[PDB]
């Protein structure tokens, strides 16, 4: 079932205090949690506290929840614990910069959803699971892994002393689970294209209405896409190192397909590394840029994410022109 953290782990987290220098840097969109590994769990506690309040969650349960969540992420190159905290931080920055647009319930729901959005990911895409008729694909027809992630999230909430949302009234509890369910399902990039087109149409015609729940859900879904893809909004060196991880996981999937007599797409073929630059260019133009463009239109304060994404697009074009540099990989 769900692995549970040790007492030394959650008890230790309770004693964590974010270093003063970081309190400032953590508020900016470009912040990279990368050089602070031992602090990731504590950084998440900190964001929840600043955004939701010191007493929003019983500290003990929060720390147990966080450490058990960390324990249930796998040792894969990309969809791991590091990614979870990175996505949660982007959400934190978005919420901080648009604080009163979102209810207390949605903020706590969204930060938790981001921390658990890829829970128990095994390193295999929906394409893989569905093409090899894996049990998960049978259980979950569409958004296969995303539905699994949500199921895992609730499972962890049900562990003894892990339910941070239990003090919520019966209706708010149901509400927060729905916010979390929709948010995590929104990370299925397949759904992003339609969501973005709908929001773009709503925004341009003037139909967009944040008081309209159906509209709210779409905005939140886009925010989720924005946070999931946030590596393209970090300083170039950071963006490049993360791209290496993204491909390490995709190539591993490609190697498995080969072993089973199925050739993988170029992107998952480690024998086609030369096409990465062009592949990323395609991704920014078809996905990232449109995403941050629409998000900025709806939530002006998120403007920095679009500016950063555009700067990285420019770096990939520079790579393609034959003006690359500094090649360091751990």
Ligand X SMILES: Nc1ncnc2c1ncn2[C@@H]1O[C@@H]2COP(=O)(O)O[C@H]2[C@H]1O
DSSP, residue by residue, 250-266: HHHHHHHHHHTT-PPPG
Task: Tell me whether residue 162 is one of the annotated catalytic residues.
Answer: no
DSSP, residue by residue, 179-197: HHHHHHHHT-HHHHHHHHH
Is residue 252 a contact residue for ligand X (CB under 6 A)? no
* Cβ-count burial 35-63 (b if 16+ within 10 Å, e if not): ebeebbbbbbbbbbbbbbeeebbebebbb
Return the axis-axis angle of helices 303-320 and 236-259, rounded to nearest 10°.
Answer: 70
Residue 328 CB partners (closer than 8 Å, separation 6+): none
Instruction: Name the minimum Å distance from CB 316 to Zn ion.
Output: 21
List the single partner that 245 binds among Zn ion, Mg ion, ligand X, none, CB under 5 to 8 Å by kind.
none
Is residue 163 a contact residue for Mg ion (CB under 5 A)? no
Q: Please, which of residues 149-208 interact with ligand X by CB under 6 A?
A: 189
Instruction: Name the minimum Å distance from CB 107 to ligand X.
Output: 23
Q: Please, which of residues 92-131 interact with Mg ion by CB under 5 A?
A: 118
Among 51, 118, 143, 280, binds Zn ion (CB under 5 A): 118
35: which 2 tokens?
Answer: 């050089």
CA 172, distance to chain mean position in Å, is 24
Is residue 305 a contact residue for ligand X (CB under 6 A)? no
Taking alpha carbons only, the member of 286, 238, 228 closest to residue 79 is 228
Instruction: Name the minimum Å distance from CB 130 to Zn ion.
Output: 18
- Terminal CA-CA length for the chain: 33
- DSSP state at residue 233: G
Cα torsion 131, 133, 136, 139 to 10°: value is: 120
Q: How many CB atoms lie within 10 A of CB 207?
A: 12
Is residue 246 a contact residue for ligand X (CB under 6 A)? yes
Return the axis-axis angle of helices 144-157 and 59-71, rounded to nearest 10°.
Answer: 140
Stretch that binds ligand X, among 90-98, 215-223, 227-235, 290-298 (CB under 6 A): 227-235
**Active-site residue (options: 49, 79, 134, 148):** 79
Stretch that binds ligand X, among 28-36, 99-107, 228-236, 301-309 (CB under 6 A): 228-236
Instruction: Name the minimum Å distance from CB 87 to Zn ion.
Output: 6
Binding mask 65-84 for ligand X (x = CB under 6 A): --------------x-----
Binding mask 164-193 for Mg ion (x = CB under 5 A): -----------------------x------
Among 32, 106, 228, 249, binds Zn ion (CB under 5 A): 228
Is residue 231 a contact residue for ligand X (CB under 6 A)? yes
Instruction: Name the minimum Å distance from CB 79 to Mg ion.
Output: 6
Give me the active site residues, please. Answer: 79
Residues that bind Zn ion (CB under 5 A): 118, 228
- Chain contacts with Mg ion (rule: CB under 5 A): 118, 187
């Amino acid at each position: 079932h769900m692995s549970i953290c040790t007492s030394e782990e959650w008890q230790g987290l309770m004693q964590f205090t974010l270093p003063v220098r970081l309190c400032k840097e953590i508020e900016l969109f470009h912040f990279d949690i990368g050089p602070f590994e031992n602090m990731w769990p504590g950084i998440f506690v900190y964001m929840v506290h600043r955004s939701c309040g010191t007493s929003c969650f019983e500290l003990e349960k929060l720390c147990r929840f966080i450490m058990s969540v960390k324990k249930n992420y796998r040792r894969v190159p990309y969809h791991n614990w590091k990614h979870a905290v990175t996505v949660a931080h982007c959400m934190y920055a978005i919420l901080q910069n648009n604080h009163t647009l979102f209810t207390d319930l949605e903020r706590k729901g969204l930060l938790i959803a981001c921390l658990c959005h890829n829970l128990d990911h095994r390193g295999f895409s929906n394409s893989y699971l569905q093409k090899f008729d894996h049990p998960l694909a049978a259980l979950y027809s569409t958004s296969t892994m995303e539905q699994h992630h949500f199921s895992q999230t609730v499972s962890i909430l049900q562990l003894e002393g892990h339910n941070i949302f239990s003090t919520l009234s019966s209706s708010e509890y149901e509400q927060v689970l729905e916010i979390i369910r929709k948010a995590i399902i929104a990370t299925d990039l397949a759904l992003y294209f339609g969501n973005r087109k709908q929001l773009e149409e709503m925004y341009q015609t003037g139909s967009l209405n944040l008081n309209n729940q159906s509209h709210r859900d779409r905005v939140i879904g886009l925010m989720m896409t924005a946070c999931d893809l946030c590596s393209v909004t970090k300083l170039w060196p950071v963006t490049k190192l993360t791209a290496n991880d993204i491909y390490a996981e995709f190539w591993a999937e490609g190697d498995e397909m080969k072993k089973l007599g199925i050739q993988p797409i170029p992107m998952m073929d480690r024998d086609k590394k030369d096409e990465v630059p062009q592949g990323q260019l395609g991704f920014y133009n078809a996905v990232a840029i449109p995403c941050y463009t629409t998000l900025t239109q709806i939530l002006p304060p998120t403007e920095p994410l679009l500016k950063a994404c555009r700067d990285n697009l420019s770096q990939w074009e520079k790579v393609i022109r034959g003006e690359e540099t500094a090649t360091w990989i751990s």
